[PDB]
Curated annotation (Swiss-Prot), chain A:
The lineage of its organism: Eukaryota, Fungi, Dikarya, Ascomycota, Saccharomycotina. The PAF1 complex is a multifunctional complex. Involved in transcription initiation via genetic interactions with TATA-binding proteins. Involved in elongation. It regulates 3'-end formation of snR47 by modulating the recruitment or stable association of NRD1 and NAB3 with RNA polymerase II. Also has a role in transcription-coupled histone modification. Required for activation of RAD6 ubiquitin conjugate and the BRE1 ubiquitin ligase which ubiquitinate 'Lys-126' histone H2B. It comes from the Eukaryota. Disulfide bonds: none annotated. This is Cell division control protein 73. The gene is CDC73.
From Swiss-Prot, chain B:
The chain holds residues 10 to 922 of 1077 of the full protein. It is found in: Nucleus, Nucleoplasm. This is RNA polymerase-associated protein CTR9. Present with 12900 molecules/cell in log phase SD medium. Component of the PAF1 complex which consists of at least CDC73, CTR9, LEO1, PAF1 and RTF1. Interacts with SPT6. Interacts with FACT subunits POB3 and SPT16. It comes from Saccharomyces cerevisiae (strain ATCC 204508 / S288c) (Baker's yeast). GO terms for molecular function: RNA polymerase II C-terminal domain phosphoserine binding; RNA polymerase II complex binding; RNA polymerase II-specific DNA-binding transcription factor binding; transcription coregulator activity; triplex DNA binding. The PAF1 complex is a multifunctional complex. Involved in transcription initiation via genetic interactions with TATA-binding proteins. Involved in elongation. It regulates 3'-end formation of snR47 by modulating the recruitment or stable association of NRD1 and NAB3 with RNA polymerase II. Also has a role in transcription-coupled histone modification. Required for activation of RAD6 ubiquitin conjugate and the BRE1 ubiquitin ligase which ubiquitinate 'Lys-126' histone H2B. The keyword Hydrolase does not apply. Its main location: nucleus. One of its GO terms (biological process) is transcription by RNA polymerase I.
Swiss-Prot record, chain C:
Belongs to the PAF1 family. This is RNA polymerase II-associated protein 1. The gene is PAF1. The lineage of its organism: Eukaryota, Fungi, Dikarya, Ascomycota, Saccharomycotina. It comes from the Eukaryota. It comes from Saccharomyces cerevisiae (strain ATCC 204508 / S288c). Present with 1040 molecules/cell in log phase SD medium. Component of the PAF1 complex which consists of at least CDC73, CTR9, LEO1, PAF1 and RTF1. Interacts with FACT subunits POB3 and SPT16. It is found in: Nucleus, Nucleoplasm. The chain holds residues 5 to 103 of 445 of the full protein. The PAF1 complex is a multifunctional complex. Involved in transcription initiation via genetic interactions with TATA-binding proteins. Involved in elongation. It regulates 3'-end formation of snR47 by modulating the recruitment or stable association of NRD1 and NAB3 with RNA polymerase II. Also has a role in transcription-coupled histone modification. Required for activation of the RAD6/UBC2-BRE1 ubiquitin ligase complex, which ubiquitinates histone H2B to form H2BK123ub1.
From Swiss-Prot, chain D:
Transmembrane segments: none annotated. It comes from the Eukaryota. It comes from Saccharomyces cerevisiae (strain ATCC 204508 / S288c). Present with 6510 molecules/cell in log phase SD medium. Coiled coil: none annotated. It is found in: Nucleus, Nucleoplasm. This is RNA polymerase-associated protein RTF1. Component of the PAF1 complex which consists of at least CDC73, CTR9, LEO1, PAF1 and RTF1. The PAF1 complex is a multifunctional complex. Involved in transcription initiation via genetic interactions with TATA-binding proteins. Involved in elongation. It regulates 3'-end formation of snR47 by modulating the recruitment or stable association of NRD1 and NAB3 with RNA polymerase II. Also has a role in transcription-coupled histone modification. Required for activation of RAD6 ubiquitin conjugate and the BRE1 ubiquitin ligase which ubiquitinate 'Lys-126' histone H2B. The chain holds residues 508 to 558 of 558 of the full protein.
């Protein structure tokens, strides 16, 4: 089915808070905003790759 | 000090005798004033004695007796004689209209009577000052402060205009000064008003009303309240019967119980004296709104909320239209406080609204309004009111705290939601941080009040959300340090979260110690918190006591299999150490996935497993798995998106190195889909450095090495990783920057002891040294390349790895030996060793042995095996012979030079005298 | 030119690496935004400020019946103040500026 | 003639007296969250009034 019904871990999750998950861990150890690359990759790669 | 007390005796001339009859204006006055009318009409007394007896009546608590005696007097004197008598009556009724415990219609009656008599007197004499002052005071009592002040100004200009019109001047008139000082206090021009009050003090230090009162009022408004109190105390020192000075001193006592108390005992003494003085004054001034609002304060802080409400309802409301609206606002604000304390937030809202209606600048009432809005779950509305208050109170600690917490709650809630964009999240985080840090800066600027440590906890969580965990550590340690400064017990939660912040920073020993403190602060019977604390300890000791971690993991996975993190890391540790058979691993992950198939952490662990093995399950199932994660569970999941983009990049690069029409354009399309996936990840999270690294890799594989290197440098500044260092080295190699390529290759080797990646890095070190060798014809660089390649090959056959790689490094070694031979052969003998040429001949023989083992192998087509044959039978015949020619030349060279020294020997033997 | 060593750039997401778990702090009602203790915190500082103006008369009723000679003998003199006044020190400190 | 090391250690214990009064004021309950009520409730003054 799915996994087994454990009331004692259910109340463990209620009191837990996740420091880092699988997705935030991809920010590294110090925050670097890489949003500008959205523009960069689209002027330096896509338009040069679309020459085909 | 001077005196303007009234004479306590009157002598009236008698008319039968010419002697005098004496009246004590203190005692002798009849209980009904008509008993003196008689005496004043037979002996035809002057009107001034009528006025004197009436003034005595009024100044001894019998103003009605006086108004009626001057009423009687109006029958006795005729037209112009009445002028003074009307002026008196005006000021009489004014003082009846000043009844504090009076009703509203009686006060309007007394003011009507005042202006009746004033219009009469001014008709008889318009320029008598008693009339003129009576006019401005009338305007004052009718709230027309602007008109009162301009009529005072017109009068003052007029009086100077009729002494510079009779040629003289005037020294200041105390009552015009006093009215202008009061009116300037009303216009909130406090400083100006202070000066006038101060001016009066030097002109008349026994003036009534006491100008020290106004001095203190303006000192208090100008934030020198300390001095304010002194002047008020001064006023009570000079006159203990002055009840308003007494009340001002009482207010000073309440304020000084807060400002002057050193500790708890002194505060209790000062507040108890303030309260007993309040009781003493109040039990003879029971309709004083100020004392009633003070009682309200006391009853609120004593928890007696019903009495707060009762005071408002049964006392203040009955007399509300005559209370000054600032005092009424204080009383309605306390009534709202009481309603709030009783959990009746509708009525506390109503009363904070009413308090704001009577004083729009009542700060505490507005804070209460916003709080009642919070209590009614009107969050955005409460934010509106708090921010409108912030527009003019940005330096208020309590307001910065409240707004910081409201916005922190909004940020945390936004984090738990799916549909919160990255800029919504960051804007919320930064707004809450702005407010909370301004709270901290303001609270620490003062040194009387302590920091609410909740602010430290919330700030450290917010900096979690900003990916600044050392700041989290710093702020939470400030919380713990403050707690222990006030000798308060440290919550298990703060120790545990402090240990987590220490873990994320690399201090596993401090984290271990704090997790053990947290667990030491727990009952043995409880197991909900004990599961998380056991996982925390095991997770912290993975790299230092891995045998303890695996035991804890086995216990948590056996007893409580639903605890996911323990399962994931138990399987990770046993897989990464080859402690689990690959069959039983491939079974364990499926039994871990097929019961928690929506757990995105488990899905990402599964994707990692599929990518990592690269044998049992490869890119087919990882493409389907990650697209299942996207199109069925999140579709914004950075992890699955990046794995998809990575597989697209691998198929793109393996399409770009072949020549097949339809199937080199599927590499142009796959680079584009990979770019699109990285771009979407950056839309969801612009701080995702792995998307940046993938884009940089695509930049480098379009031979755009500048941008690729700058992205890889910025990624390395936040990711201490095998791959980013390897990519930096790779990229330096492709820029012909052989020095930095070699530096970064040996760096990635000196950290990150990884055995499956080691031979490839040694082979690329060999490639870099080979590159720097052919571009300087240096045999030392060829030999550095040679040792690197030799150790790479020995490890390739230690691993038993792909014969692709072993053949490639065998070719590399043979090529290097041939290059060494051919570079030594083209060298000046003064730069060679005989033993270096010997070594190069034996190196060339071993190069040819590897070349013929590459030729007879029926699968090696990295060189055409027609170039390979020619170098075999160029190594076999000719090059060899060449390298012995340069060998024989070298030693003949060597011998020749032993020729040369001995000739020098005989020449410097020959040269003696 | 001919040394064989292929270059392979890698991105390679990590294993999730589930760090230690935080615990939600126990509720502290007196430090919420809705706490009355914040209003009390502020009251400690601003305590009785809005009461010092006892009434619309500012605690300072104007009464001409307090001036001998005036209102009975028409003696305006006492309104223009004593000349050559002494000003005791506990009164003289009250002409200072705020601080 | 440097016998004045008695009066430079008078300055330092006067400073730490000043610091002990600052600390005593910080942890005083009447200046802390919820403490003003707690201290008002500990008073032994009994108004006899009903409104």
């Amino acid at each position: 089915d799915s996994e087994v019904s454990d009331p004692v871990v259910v109340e463990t999750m209620k009191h837990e808070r996740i420091l880092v998950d699988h997705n935030s861990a991809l920010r590294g150890a110090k925050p670097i905003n890489f949003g500008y690359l959205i523009k960069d990759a689209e002027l330096k790669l896509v338009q040069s790759i679309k020459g085909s | 000090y001077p005196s303007m007390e009234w004479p306590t005796s009157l002598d009236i001339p008698l008319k039968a005798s010419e002697e005098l009859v004496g009246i004590d204006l203190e005692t002798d006055l009849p209980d009904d004033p008509t008993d003196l009318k008689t005496l004043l009409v037979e002996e035809n007394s002057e009107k001034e004695h009528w006025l004197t007896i009436a003034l005595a009546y009024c100044n001894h608590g019998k103003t009605n007796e006086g108004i009626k005696l001057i009423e009687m007097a109006l029958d006795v004197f005729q037209n112009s004689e009445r002028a003074s008598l009307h002026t008196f009556l005006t000021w009489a009724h004014l003082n009846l209209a000043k009844g504090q415990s009076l009703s509203v219609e009686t006060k309007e009656h007394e003011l009507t009577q005042a202006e009746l008599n004033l219009k009469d007197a001014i008709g008889f004499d318009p320029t008598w000052i008693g009339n003129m002052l009576a006019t401005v005071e009338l305007y004052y009592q009718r709230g027309h402060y602007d008109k009162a002040l301009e009529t005072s100004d017109l009068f003052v200009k007029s009086i100077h205009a009729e002494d510079h019109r009779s040629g003289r001047q005037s020294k200041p008139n105390c009552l015009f000064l006093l009215l202008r000082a009061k009116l300037l206090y009303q216009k909130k021009n406090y400083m100006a008003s202070l000066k006038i009050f101060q001016e009066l003090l030097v002109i008349n230090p026994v003036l009534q009303p006491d100008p020290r009162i106004g001095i203190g009022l303006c000192f208090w408004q100008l934030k020198d309240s300390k001095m304010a109190i002194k002047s008020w105390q001064r006023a009570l020192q000079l006159n203990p019967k002055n009840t308003s000075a007494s009340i001002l001193v009482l207010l000073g006592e309440f304020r000084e119980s807060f400002t002057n108390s050193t500790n708890d005992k002194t505060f209790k003494e000062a507040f108890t004296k303030a309260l007993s003085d309040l009781n003493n004054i109040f039990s003879e001034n029971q309709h004083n709104p100020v004392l009633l609002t003070l009682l309200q304060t006391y009853y609120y802080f004593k928890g007696d909320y019903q009495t707060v409400l009762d005071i408002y309802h049964h006392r203040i409301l009955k007399m509300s239209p005559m209370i000054a609206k600032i005092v009424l606002s204080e009383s309605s604000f306390w009534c709202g406080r009481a309603h709030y304390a009783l959990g009746d937030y509708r009525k506390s809202f109503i009363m904070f609204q009413e308090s704001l209606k009577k004083n729009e600048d009542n700060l505490l009432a507005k804070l209460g309004l916003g709080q009642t809005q919070i209590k009614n779950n009107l969050l955005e509305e409460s934010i509106i009111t708090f921010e409108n208050l912030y527009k003019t109170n940005e330096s208020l600690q309590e307001l910065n705290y409240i707004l910081g917490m409201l916005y922190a709650g909004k940020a945390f809630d936004a984090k738990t939601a799916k549909n919160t964009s990255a800029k919504e999240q960051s804007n919320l985080n930064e707004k809450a941080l702005k407010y909370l840090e301004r709270y901290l800066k303001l609270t620490l600027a003062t040194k009387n009040q302590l920091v609410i440590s909740r602010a430290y906890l919330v700030i450290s969580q917010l900096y979690e959300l900003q990916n600044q965990y050392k700041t989290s550590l710093d702020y939470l340690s400030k919380a713990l340090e403050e707690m222990e400064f006030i000798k308060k017990e440290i919550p298990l939660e703060v120790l545990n979260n402090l240990a987590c912040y220490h873990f994320i920073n690399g201090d596993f020993i401090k984290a271990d110690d704090l997790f053990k403190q947290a667990k030491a602060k727990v009952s043995d019977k409880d197991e909900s918190v004990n599961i998380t604390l056991e996982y925390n300890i095991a997770r912290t000791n993975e790299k230092n006591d891995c045998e303890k971690s695996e035991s804890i993991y086995s216990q948590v996975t056996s007893l409580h299999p639903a605890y996911i993190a323990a399962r994931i890391r138990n399987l990770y540790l046993k897989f990464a150490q080859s402690k689990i058979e690959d069959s039983d691993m491939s079974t364990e992950m499926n039994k871990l996935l097929d019961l928690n198939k929506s757990d995105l952490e488990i899905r990402s662990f599964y994707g990692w497993y599929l990518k990592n093995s690269k044998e049992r399950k490869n890119n087919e199932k990882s493409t389907t798995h990650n697209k299942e994660t996207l199109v069925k569970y999140n579709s914004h999941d950075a992890y699955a998106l990046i794995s998809l983009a990575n597989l697209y990049v691998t198929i793109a690069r393996d399409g770009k190195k072949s020549r097949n029409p339809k199937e080199q354009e599927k590499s142009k399309h796959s680079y584009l889909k990979a770019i699109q996936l990285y771009q979407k990840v950056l839309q969801v999270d612009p701080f995702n450095i792995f998307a940046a690294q993938g884009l940089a890799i695509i930049f480098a594989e379009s031979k755009r090495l500048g941008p690729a290197l700058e992205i890889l440098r910025k990624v390395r500044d936040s990711l201490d990783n095998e791959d980013v260092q390897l990519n930096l080295a790779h990229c330096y190699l492709e820029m012909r920057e052989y020095g930095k390529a070699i530096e970064n290759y040996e760096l990635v080797l000196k950290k990150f002891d990884n055995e499956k990646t080691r031979p490839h890095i040694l082979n690329l070190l060999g490639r870099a040294w080979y590159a720097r060798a052919i571009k300087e014809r240096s045999v030392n660089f060829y030999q550095k390349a040679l040792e690197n390649a030799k150790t790479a090959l020995d490890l390739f056959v230690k691993e038993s790895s792909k014969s692709k790689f072993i053949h490639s490094v065998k070719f590399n070694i043979a090529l290097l030996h041939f290059q060494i031979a051919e570079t030594l052969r083209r060298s000046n003998p003064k730069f060679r060793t005989v033993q270096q040429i010997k070594d190069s001949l034996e190196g060339l023989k071993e190069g040819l042995e590897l070349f013929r083992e590459l030729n007879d192998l029926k699968e090696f087509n990295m060189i055409p095996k027609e170039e390979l044959e020619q170098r075999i039978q160029l190594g076999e015949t000719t090059m060899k012979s060449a390298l012995e020619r340069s060998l024989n030349e070298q030693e003949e060279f060597e011998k020749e030079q032993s020729a040369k020294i001995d000739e020098a020997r005989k020449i410097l033997e020959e040269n003696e005298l | 030119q001919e040394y064989i060593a292929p270059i392979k750039y890698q991105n390679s997401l990590p294993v999730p690496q589930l760090p230690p778990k935080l615990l939600v702090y126990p509720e502290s009602p007196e430090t919420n935004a809705d706490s009355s203790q914040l209003i009390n915190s502020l009251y400690i500082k601003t305590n009785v400020t809005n009461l010092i103006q006892q009434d619309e008369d500012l605690g300072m009723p104007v009464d001409l019946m307090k001036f001998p000679g005036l209102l009975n003998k028409l003696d305006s003199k006492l309104l223009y103040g004593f000349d050559n006044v002494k000003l005791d020190k506990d009164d003289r400190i009250l002409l200072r500026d705020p601080r | 003639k440097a016998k004045e090391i008695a009066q430079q250690e008078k300055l330092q214990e006067d400073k730490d007296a000043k610091d002990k009064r600052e600390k005593e004021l910080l942890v005083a309950q009447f200046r802390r969250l919820g403490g003003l009520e707690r201290m008002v409730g500990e008073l032994d003054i009994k108004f006899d009034l009903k409104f």
